[PDB]
């Protein structure tokens, strides 16, 4: 039972579909990465930040 319950989180994003970005020409045009993209990235856990706020 230890580290089974509430031990992991996945947080999604709008990056694939589209967003405005703080880059010249992208501030008012919705653009996304495309259907082909990198899927996941591990947030580093050595200081336990995810237990204060994920």
């Amino acid at each position: 039972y230890e580290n089974v319950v509430l031990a992991f989180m996945e947080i999604p994003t709008l990056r694939a579909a589209g967003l405005s970005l703080p880059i010249a020409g992208l501030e008012d045009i919705v653009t996304g990465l495309g259907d082909f993209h990198y899927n996941e990235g591990w947030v580093d856990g050595a200081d336990k930040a995810f237990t204060i706020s994920a």
């Binding site: 259907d35 082909f36 993209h37 899927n39 996941e40």
Partner: protein, 55 residues
């Protein structure tokens, strides 16, 4: 073992609701209108299990 471990995480990333067969990497299980892979970014190449001679 590696291709199934990859495939199970591809199913997760394409958010599939498909029930696993007894062997998920047998192509005979993927059709008709079963796996519905037509929109996917990534897939595993299926193969017959009795021919796999890897250690």
């Amino acid at each position: 073992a590696l291709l199934l471990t990859l495939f199970v995480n591809i199913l997760r990333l394409e958010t599939s609701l498909w029930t696993l067969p007894d062997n998920p990497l047998d192509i005979s299980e993927w059709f008709p209108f079963s796996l519905n892979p037509g929109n996917w970014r990534n897939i595993v190449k299926p193969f017959p299990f009795l021919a796999d001679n890897s250690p």
